[PDB]
Design a protein around this ligand. Structure first.
Ligand SMILES: [Mg+2]
Lengths: 515, 685, 118, 52, 47
C-alpha cells in the first residue's frame, strides 16, 4: 500500500494554486472528477470578439519590399587577422618534414626580406597612442636580433615588459573591485552602460573580402589522411562526392584562412597556458605545398600576448597583432578604424613589363580573445565538413526527384550553369566548383564574423525565403503579420559588416526571384 | 562578378539547399542573453499577458500572485494568459474519447514507473539551483548537498533508495519550522519562510533562462513521465520519437489529407510556431489536466503528480547575481546583488533599466520576484505537447461539424497544421477556428513566425518537407578531434563519435569520410604516430619505421603503430584491434596484447580492447620559498604588481615615513633610496 | 635597511631574479586545464608523459639503437612508478616478449562479435 | 652542429653497433662506447630548454 | 651571476647568499656567519 499525503504548507499552496472561485483542492478535484463536456469551447468561441482572428494577407509577387539596411558611417574590419590584405614571407623547407619550431621558421622567413625602411605611421588609430604601436614593432625587430647575442638559443621569445607593450596589452587598466560595504555612497557611480551599438552602413570591402575568399590559389592548403578501401555501394558514391569536392576546395583561399585560423589560435592557446604571465612573441605561421609541390612555410606577421592567468573559458587574453600587407590603408580608411598602420619597408617585383617597387605596411591593432574563441578558431576545419554537407545534401535532394544519383553529372558538367553572382548586366552563373568554394567561403566567414546578429538574421530571413519559394511553386502563400517578420529581420541589421552583406545578398536575390 | 551565395535559390529550391541557411552547424562562442535585465523582462512580460487576472497575497510566501485563468476573453491578437478551465477539460475529454483508454492505461504504466524509479535518476541533468549553498551547481552535487541537510534534519526516508521516498522527505521539509545544515568549514539556520522561498526558486545561469531547485525537480520527472506515456500513444505528437522515425510522421499526415481530398477539396499546410509559449499557459491549467487524466485513480498517484504544478504556481524567480556598475574618473566597479535590489536607490540607473525595475518592484519579495503565471523554458515539454495535440484532435470532421476540417503535428511550442475545406473562405474559417480554439487554452500562434501555403511543402522542428522528400543534413557536428584519454581509447571514441552522428544526427556519408580523415590527421599529429612509410620527422619516426620494416602484413599495424587507416563507413562500429586482428603478424599481436607489459594499469560508453596503447599519462624548492619568506619581511600589497616592484615600493614608503617620525637618520634613508635604484636597474634589462 | 639590501642580492642570482619579475602578489598563494584534448597534446610534447611500473627498467633498455631515451628514473605520485616516452610502447611492440594471444577473441567476445556480422 | 643533426635525421637505418675489424693495439670496446655516446648526446640536445 | 652586474658586486652577492644558506642548514657557526657579513660590508665601502 503506497500512501502519499498533501498537508500543512503544501495543502495551503495546493488550495492557492487553483482557478479563481475554487478555494479548496478537494472541492476542485470533485468539479473535474464529475466534469462532462457541454460545448464549453463552441460556446466561448461565440462569446469571444471577432477582432480576435488569423486573417490571411495573401503573399503576391508585389507584396515583399527590399530589407532596409541602416545608415551611418561605413562598417570596420573586426576579423582577428588580415584576410585578402594579408602578406607572407615564405621559405621552402623540404628536407625537414613534420612538426618543427615556429620561432625559427619565422626568423628564417624574416631573413628572406632585406627591404626594411625606417618605420613611420601612415594611418593612425584615432582612439590610441600611435607612437607606442611604432615602438612595439621596433622592439620586435630589436629583440629578434638579440637572440643572435645569446650563448644558448631559446625555444620561444618573451618580449621585455616595456611601457608601449604594458600599454598595448592593457596592463594596469583593469579597474579595482570595491566591496559595497566600503563604497556604499559614491556620487558619480553609474551601471555598466550596455549602449545602443551606434549603427554602421554597408561598405564595399566586405564583398571584396568574400569575392577573394572564393578564388583559387597556386597552393594546396589542406592535405587529408588516407581512408579504408571502398566496398559498400555508399562508400564508392561517398568517396566520389568527397574527392570531387576536396579537389575544388584544395587550393581555395578560404582554406588558407582556415589554416591561418587553426595555426594562430592553436599557437595562442598553447602560449596562453604555458607562459601565463610572460609577454610571449607568437609568430603568425601557415604551411602549403606549392603548385609544383614542395613544402613551403609562411610568416604573415607577429602577435605579442599579454598576461593569461585564465580561470574561465570566458576570461580574456589581450594581445597586439602586427601583420604585413601590400595594401595602402589610405584607399579604404573606414575599414581600418581599429588598426594603426605603419609603412615598414619596400618590396621589389621585377616583372615581364619591367621593375615594380611597392611599399610594405604593418596593420598593428590592440585586440583580445578567450579559450572559447581560440578553440572556435582551432576547430575551423569543420567549415570543410559544413561546406561538403551542403553540397552533399543538395545532390541527395536534386537526385530524389529523378531517383538516380546526380553526383557525377553536377561535377563533370563543364558548362557554367549555377547562378552564384551578379554583374552590371545581371545574375552571372558559374561552375559547381565555384559553388563549392562559394559555400566554403560562406562557412568560413560565418565562423570568422560569427555574431548573434547573424544567428538572428539567418533564422528570420529563412522564413521569408521559404515564403518566396512557395510563391515560385504557385502554392498560394499567405502571411499573418508580414510587417512583423520584416521588423524582426531588420532588428538584426545594426553594424556587423557580414550580416549587412547577407541582407544586401537577400535584396539582390529578392529582385531576381520575382520575375 | 560579385559572388552572392543566396542567388543559388534561383536554380535550387530553398528546401534542397536549406542546409546553407544554417550558419554555424555547432555551438557558437557567445550564446548571450541570460543577464539580470533579461530575467526581469520575462517576469514583466509574463504578468503583462496575464494582467487582468485576480491578484492574491500568498499565505505561506507573502507574495503578490496573478491568476489570469477563467479570466476575460481577448479582444486583441496580443498574447493572452487568460485560459478557460471548461475549455481545457473539454479538449482533454474529447482526446480520451478519440483515443479511448489513453489516460487510464498510461497511468497504469506510470504507476509501475513512480515506484521502481530511483533517487540515482535525479543526478542526471543540467545545472541545478542548490538551495543548500544558495548557488547554481552540477545536478549530482546539488543532490548530495540536499540529502546532507535531509540527513541532518529527521528526514532519513531518502536513504531507502526509491525516488517517491525522497519526495516524502521534501514534503515533510516544508512543514518543519527550522531547517539546519552542517556546512563543514558552521551550523546554518533558515526560518520556515526563507526556506520556502528557496524551495520554490528558479535561478538563472551562464551555461535555458533559469534552472529550478532540487525539491521541485523530483516531481517534474513523474509528470513528464506521465506526459511521455500519453505522447507515446498519440500519432500527432512529435516527441519523443527518434531521427528517421520522425521524417515518416511528416509523410503520413500529408498522405492522410491528400488521398481523401477529391477534385474540389483544397488543402493548405501552415508552417506553425507558437509565440511566448512558456509565459502564457499557466501552472493551474497543468494541474487541471493532470487531475482529469488521474480521475478514477488512487489518491497517492494523483498527489505526487499534482505537486509539480502547485509549486510552479507559487514559484519565485531570483534575478541572477545583479547589476555591475563602473565609475569613469575614480576607476571603480561594483556588483549590487539581487538580495539588495529591493533595498537600493532607483536614481543611479539609466532610462531603459529604471522602468523595468519600477514595474517589477511590486512583485519583489526577499530579493526574488514572485511569478505565479507562466513557466521557465523546456520544463513541461511533453505535457504541453498533449495540450497542443488536444486542439489538433478537435479538427476531426465530427468536432468541427463543418465542411472544413484539420490535422497536423505538435511538439512543445513548434507545430504544423493542415486545414482542408471545399473553397478558400472555408480554409480561412478552419484556420480562424484553430487560432481561436487555441486562445481559449493559452496557446498564441505567432503571426510573425508562422506562414501558410498549399499542401506539398512545410517545416516542422527544422525538417524541411518538399513533395515527399525532407532534406538530409546534421545541424550539430561534434568535435572530430582527439579525446585525450590515450592512443587506444581516443581511436575507438573518435570512430564511435562519427558512426553515432550518422545513425542519430543524420550526417551524410561523404561528410563522415572527411570527418574520419580530419580525426585520423589530428590523431597521428597528437600521438606522433604518422604512417611508417612516410618521411615526416618526430621522436617516434625511428621506432615506427623500424617496426614498419620488421612487419610483413602492415595492414595489421594499428594507426598508433604507424599502420594504415582501414576504417570507412561500414567499419566504424568495430574496435580497431578486432578490425585488424586477422591481418596482424603472430609476433606483433604477441607483443601488442601481452598483458605482462608495464603500460596497462592493474594486470587484467566506448568499446576498446586492452593493448600496450591502453597506457596512463602523468598528472628549486629552496629558491621559491626563499623569495616568498623575504616577502613576509615586507608584509607580516597591490594584486596585479609583480613581487620585486611591490617589495621596492614598500621600501620607499617605510623609508620616507621613518625619515619624518625620526627612526633612521639622513645616512640610513639615502642608503635605502640608493639600493632601491640598483634593484630597478636590474629589472629593465 | 637589511630587507632592501637582501632584495639586491636575490636580483644578482638570475634564477631567483626570474621568480620575482614573473610571479605576481595574487599568484603566490598558488605556489603555497579542464579540456583534456589540449592537456594530452601538451603532455605528448614532453619527453616522458606516460607512467609505468619500475619493472619496465628491467624489461626494455634505457636507450634504443639511435640513442633515444625510452624511460627516466623520475618521481611519480603515490608509489615507485617511473616516467616513460611513447617510444617505449612502440619499442615493446617491435622487440617485446611474445605470449600466446588465443584467449583475447574469447575474453573480448562482446566486442569481437561486432566483426562476425560483417 | 645543426647541419649535422639535419643530415643525421635523413638516415633511419641505424643498427645495434658491433665491432667488425678491431684495432690490434687498442681498447676496442671504448671505440664502440664513444659512437654510442655521440648518438646519445645528440638526442640530449633536444632535452635542453635552450639549444646550444 | 647577472650579465649587467660588475665582477665585485656579483662576487659580494654570491657570498651573502652562501652565508645565509650555510647558516640555516648549519655548516658555519654564528661566529663564521658574522665574519663573512662584516668583510662583505668592507668591500662595499671601497666601491
Ligand atoms: Mg515551425
Amino acid at each position: 500500500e503506497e500512501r502519499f499525503e498533501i498537508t500543512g504548507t503544501m495543502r495551503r499552496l495546493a488550495d492557492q494554486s487553483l482557478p479563481p472561485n475554487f478555494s479548496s483542492l478537494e472541492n476542485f478535484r470533485a468539479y473535474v472528477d464529475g466534469f462532462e463536456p457541454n460545448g464549453c469551447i463552441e460556446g466561448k468561441l461565440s462569446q469571444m470578439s471577432k477582432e480576435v482572428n488569423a486573417r490571411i494577407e495573401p503573399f503576391l509577387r508585389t507584396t515583399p519590399r527590399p530589407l532596409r539596411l541602416p545608415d551611418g558611417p561605413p562598417c570596420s574590419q573586426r576579423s582577428k587577422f588580415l584576410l585578402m590584405d594579408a602578406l607572407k614571407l615564405s621559405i621552402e623547407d623540404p628536407s625537414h618534414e613534420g612538426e618543427g619550431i615556429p620561432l625559427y621558421d619565422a626568423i628564417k622567413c624574416m631573413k628572406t626580406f632585406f627591404g626594411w625602411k625606417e618605420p613611420n605611421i601612415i594611418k593612425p588609430h584615432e582612439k590610441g597612442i600611435n607612437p607606442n604601436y611604432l615602438l612595439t614593432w621596433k622592439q620586435v625587430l630589436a629583440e629578434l636580433q638579440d637572440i643572435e647575442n645569446e650563448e644558448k638559443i631559446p625555444r620561444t621569445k618573451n618580449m621585455k615588459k616595456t611601457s608601449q607593450l604594458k600599454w598595448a596589452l592593457g596592463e594596469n587598466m583593469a579597474p579595482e573591485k570595491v566591496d559595497f560595504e566600503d563604497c556604499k555612497d559614491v556620487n558619480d557611480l553609474k551601471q555598466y552602460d550596455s549602449d545602443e551599438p551606434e549603427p554602421r552602413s554597408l561598405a564595399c570591402w566586405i564583398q571584396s573580402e568574400f569575392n577573394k575568399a572564393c578564388e583559387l590559389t597556386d597552393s594546396s592548403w589542406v592535405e587529408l589522411d588516407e581512408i579504408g578501401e571502398d566496398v559498400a555501394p555508399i562508400e564508392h558514391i561517398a568517396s566520389m562526392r568527397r574527392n570531387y569536392f576536396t579537389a575544388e576546395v584544395s587550393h581555395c583561399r578560404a582554406t588558407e584562412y582556415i589554416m591561418k585560423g587553426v595555426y594562430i589560435n592553436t599557437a595562442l592557446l598553447n602560449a596562453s597556458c604555458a607562459a601565463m604571465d610572460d609577454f610571449q612573441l607568437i609568430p603568425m605561421i601557415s604551411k602549403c605545398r606549392t603548385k609544383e609541390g614542395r613544402r613551403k612555410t609562411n610568416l604573415y606577421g607577429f602577435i605579442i600576448k599579454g598576461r593569461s592567468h585564465l580561470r574561465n573559458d570566458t576570461d580574456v587574453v589581450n594581445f597586439v597583432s602586427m601583420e604585413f600587407s601590400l595594401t595602402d590603408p589610405r584607399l579604404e580608411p573606414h575599414k581600418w578604424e581599429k588598426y594603426c598602420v605603419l609603412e615598414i619597408g619596400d618590396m621589389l617585383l621585377r616583372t615581364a613589363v619591367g621593375q615594380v617597387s611597392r611599399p610594405m605596411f604593418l596593420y598593428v591593432r590592440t585586440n583580445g580573445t578567450s579559450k572559447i574563441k581560440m578553440k572556435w578558431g582551432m576547430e575551423m576545419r569543420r567549415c570543410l565538413l559544413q561546406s561538403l554537407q551542403q553540397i552533399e545534401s543538395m545532390i541527395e535532394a536534386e537526385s530524389s526527384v529523378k531517383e538516380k544519383d546526380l553526383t557525377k553529372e553536377f561535377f563533370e558538367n563543364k558548362s557554367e550553369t549555377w547562378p552564384i553572382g551578379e554583374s552590371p548586366k545581371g545574375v552571372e552563373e558559374g561552375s559547381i566548383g565555384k559553388v563549392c568554394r562559394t559555400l566554403l567561403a560562406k562557412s568560413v566567414f560565418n565562423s570568422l564574423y560569427a555574431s548573434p546578429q547573424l544567428e538572428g538574421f539567418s533564422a528570420e530571413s529563412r522564413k521569408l525565403l521559404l515564403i518566396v519559394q512557395a510563391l515560385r511553386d504557385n502554392l498560394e502563400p499567405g502571411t499573418f503579420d508580414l510587417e512583423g517578420l520584416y521588423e524582426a529581420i531588420e532588428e538584426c541589421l545594426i553594424n556587423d559588416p557580414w550580416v549587412l552583406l547577407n541582407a544586401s545578398w537577400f535584396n539582390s536575390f529578392l529582385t531576381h526571384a520575382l520575375r | 562578378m560579385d559572388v552572392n551565395p543566396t542567388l543559388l535559390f534561383l536554380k535550387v529550391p530553398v528546401q534542397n539547399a536549406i542546409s546553407t541557411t544554417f550558419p554555424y552547424t555547432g555551438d557558437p562562442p557567445y550564446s548571450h542573453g541570460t543577464g539580470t535585465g533579461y530575467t526581469m523582462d520575462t517576469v514583466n512580460r509574463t504578468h503583462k499577458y496575464s494582467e487582468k487576472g485576480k491578484w492574491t497575497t500568498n499565505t505561506e510566501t507573502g507574495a503578490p500572485q496573478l491568476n489570469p485563468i477563467d479570466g476575460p476573453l481577448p479582444e486583441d491578437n496580443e498574447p493572452s494568459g487568460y485560459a478557460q478551465t471548461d475549455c481545457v477539460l473539454e479538449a482533454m475529454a474529447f482526446l480520451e474519447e478519440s483515443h479511448p483508454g489513453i489516460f487510464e492505461n498510461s497511468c497504469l504504466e506510470t504507476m509501475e514507473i513512480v515506484q521502481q524509479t530511483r533517487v540515482d535518476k535525479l543526478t542526471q541533468g543540467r545545472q541545478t539551483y542548490d538551495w543548500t549553498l544558495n548557488r547554481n551547481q552540477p545536478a549530482a552535487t546539488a543532490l548530495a548537498n540536499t540529502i546532507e541537510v535531509f540527513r541532518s534534519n529527521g528526514l532519513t526516508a531518502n536513504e531507502s533508495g526509491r525516488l517517491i521516498d525522497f519526495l516524502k522527505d521534501v514534503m515533510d521539509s516544508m512543514d518543519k519550522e527550522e531547517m539546519e545544515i552542517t556546512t563543514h568549514f558552521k551550523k546554518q539556520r533558515l526560518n520556515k519562510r526563507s526556506y520556502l522561498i528557496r524551495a520554490l526558486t528558479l535561478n538563472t545561469m551562464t551555461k535555458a533562462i533559469a534552472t529550478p531547485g532540487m525539491q521541485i525537480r523530483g516531481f517534474v520527472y513523474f509528470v513528464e513521465a506521465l506526459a511521455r506515456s500519453i505522447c507515446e500513444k498519440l500519432e500527432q505528437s512529435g516527441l519523443p520519437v527518434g531521427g528517421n522515425e520522425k521524417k515518416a510522421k511528416l509523410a503520413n499526415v500529408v498522405r492522410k489529407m491528400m488521398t481523401n481530398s477529391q477534385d474540389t477539396e483544397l488543402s493548405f499546410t501552415i508552417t506553425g510556431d507558437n509565440t511566448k509559449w512558456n509565459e502564457n499557459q499557466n501552472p493551474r491549467m497543468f494541474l487541471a489536466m493532470i487531475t482529469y487524466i488521474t480521475r478514477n485513480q488512487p489518491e497517492w498517484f494523483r498527489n505526487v503528480l499534482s505537486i509539480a504544478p502547485i509549486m510552479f504556481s507559487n514559484k519565485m524567480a531570483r534575478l541572477g547575481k545583479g547589476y555591475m556598475f563602473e565609475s569613469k574618473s575614480m576607476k571603480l566597479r561594483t556588483q549590487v546583488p539581487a538580495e539588495m535590489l529591493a533595498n537600493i536607490d532607483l536614481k543611479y540607473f539609466n532610462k531603459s533599466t529604471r522602468e523595468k525595475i519600477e514595474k517589477i518592484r511590486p512583485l519583489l519579495i526577499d530579493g526574488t520576484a514572485s511569478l505565479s503565471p507562466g513557466m521557465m523554458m523546456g520544463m513541461f515539454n511533453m505535457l504541453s505537447t498533449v495540450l497542443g495535440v488536444s486542439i489538433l484532435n478537435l479538427g476531426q470532421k465530427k468536432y468541427t461539424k463543418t465542411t472544413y476540417w484539420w490535422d497536423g503535428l505538435q511538439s512543445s511550442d513548434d507545430f504544423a497544421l493542415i486545414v482542408n475545406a471545399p473553397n478558400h473562405e472555408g480554409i480561412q474559417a478552419g484556420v480562424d477556428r484553430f487560432y481561436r480554439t487555441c486562445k481559449l487554452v493559452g496557446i498564441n500562434m505567432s503571426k510573425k513566425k508562422s506562414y501558410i501555403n498549399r499542401t506539398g511543402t512545410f517545416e516542422f522542428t527544422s525538417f524541411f518537407y518538399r513533395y515527399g522528400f525532407v532534406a538530409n543534413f546534421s545541424m550539430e557536428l561534434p568535435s572530430f578531434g582527439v579525446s585525450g584519454i590515450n592512443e587506444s581509447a581516443d581511436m575507438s571514441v573518435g570512430v564511435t563519435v562519427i558512426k553515432n552522428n550518422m545513425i542519430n544526427n543524420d550526417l551524410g556519408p561523404a561528410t563522415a569520410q572527411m570527418a574520419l580523415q580530419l580525426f585520423i590527421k589530428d590523431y597521428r599529429y597528437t600521438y606522433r604516430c604518422h604512417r611508417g612509410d612516410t618521411q615526416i620527422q618526430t621522436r617516434r619516426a625511428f621506432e615506427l619505421k623500424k617496426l614498419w620494416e620488421q612487419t610483413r602484413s602492415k595492414a595489421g599495424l594499428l594507426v598508433s603503430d604507424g599502420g594504415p587507416n582501414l576504417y570507412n563507413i561500414r567499419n566504424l562500429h568495430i574496435p580497431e584491434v578486432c578490425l585488424k586482428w586477422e591481418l596482424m603478424d603472430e609476433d606483433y599481436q604477441g607483443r601488442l596484447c601481452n598483458p605482462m607489459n608495464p603500460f596497462v594499469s592493474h594486470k587484467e560508453e566506448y568499446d576498446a580492447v586492452a593493448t600496450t596503447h591502453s597506457w596512463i599519462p602523468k598528472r628549486d624548492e629552496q629558491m621559491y620559498q626563499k623569495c616568498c619568506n623575504l616577502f613576509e619581511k615586507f608584509f607580516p600589497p597591490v594584486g596585479i604588481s609583480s613581487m620585486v616592484e611591490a617589495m621596492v615600493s614598500r621600501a620607499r614608503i617605510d623609508a620616507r615615513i621613518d625619515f619624518e617620525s625620526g627612526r633612521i637618520k639622513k645616512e640610513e634613508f639615502a642608503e635605502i633610496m640608493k639600493i632601491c635604484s640598483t634593484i630597478e636597474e636590474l629589472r629593465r634589462q | 635597511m637589511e630587507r632592501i639590501k637582501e632584495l639586491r642580492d636575490l636580483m644578482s642570482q638570475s634564477r631567483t631574479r626570474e621568480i620575482l619579475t614573473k610571479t605576481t602578489v595574487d599568484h603566490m598563494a598558488i605556489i603555497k586545464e579542464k579540456n583534456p584534448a589540449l592537456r594530452m597534446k601538451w603532455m605528448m610534447a614532453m619527453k616522458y608523459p606516460i607512467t609505468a611500473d619500475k619493472r619496465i627498467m628491467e624489461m626494455i633498455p634505457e636507450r634504443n639503437e639511435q640513442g633515444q631515451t625510452l624511460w627516466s628514473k623520475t618521481n611519480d605520485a603515490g608509489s615507485d612508478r617511473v616516467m616513460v616516452s611513447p617510444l617505449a610502447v612502440t619499442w615493446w611492440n617491435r622487440n617485446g616478449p611474445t605470449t600466446s594471444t588465443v584467449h583475447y577473441p574469447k575474453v573480448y567476445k562482446t566486442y569481437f562479435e561486432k566483426v562476425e556480422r560483417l
